[PDB]
Symmetry: C4
Subunit: 85 residues, 4 copies
Amino acid sequence: YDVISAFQKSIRGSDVDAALHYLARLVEAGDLASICRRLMVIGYEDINPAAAARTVNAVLAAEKLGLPEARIPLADVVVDLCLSP
Amino acid sequence: YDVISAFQKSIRGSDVDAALHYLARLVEAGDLASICRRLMVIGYEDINPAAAARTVNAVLAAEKLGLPEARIPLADVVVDLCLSP
Amino acid sequence: YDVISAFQKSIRGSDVDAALHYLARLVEAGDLASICRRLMVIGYEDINPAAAARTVNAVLAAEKLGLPEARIPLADVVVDLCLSPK
Amino acid sequence: YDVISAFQKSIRGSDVDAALHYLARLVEAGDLASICRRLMVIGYEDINPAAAARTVNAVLAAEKLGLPEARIPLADVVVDLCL
């Protein structure tokens, strides 16, 4: 058990509410790199090729914005990846 | 009251004419970074996930071109985001 | 008259053959940055938002490949932009 | 004959299994840049314009992640391009 793996599991399980609970904690802890890395693996490994591609746009946006505003593209992507096939 | 904020409200309000009025002014002033930052936030927050992703491409184009030609992709995504859901 | 403006005009006029005629010459001359800048301006100015956004992907691919191989993404996009609605 | 061109040929021939077999070997060898180069060329030369663009995103993810985990977007693109 750690937060970043449970984040991933909740996204694999299509659980928006849990994924965003964990996202908020990851954001507040402030390591943007590992969120970004994780979301790209999930987008490519677990998920819809337009959705996979879009995870990269959202990560570039998160990286250009930086924390705290990075939470906006990331929240979007999390829900995107949760509702996806 | 602030130009960059009024720019943001214009786009949320779906007002192309006013959004473009403010863009031309942010452009004249040379603050490429704040335009780009605001567009990505609006794209991911207020908005059509393809439209969200496409703000990143536009911003990349803007950054690679630099001002003054950056106004071109920027005006394009301003209109796109205005007319979007 | 220069070739890069004539290249731009051909794409505006949806003329695949002329645009590829010019691209090949621009590719041979080898100023990749100038070709990339112009395609992004054409993509966002003259063109279909998905097609405008794809010019960025192709330019990124062209920069990663470098010349001579950059001509592959570049040709694909000149065609994409030629056919695309305006 | 070499692995990389054989890799390309099997993607050009729509052979998912062989392409994945070559990828795993290219991954084992540790040279990401070469995989990335070939993928972009196939996607642009042999191929949807959306499938072409989308290979650049996969490549960006691959470079951002590095190997070993870069194998994840790369496998996705190989399959994507095979079909």
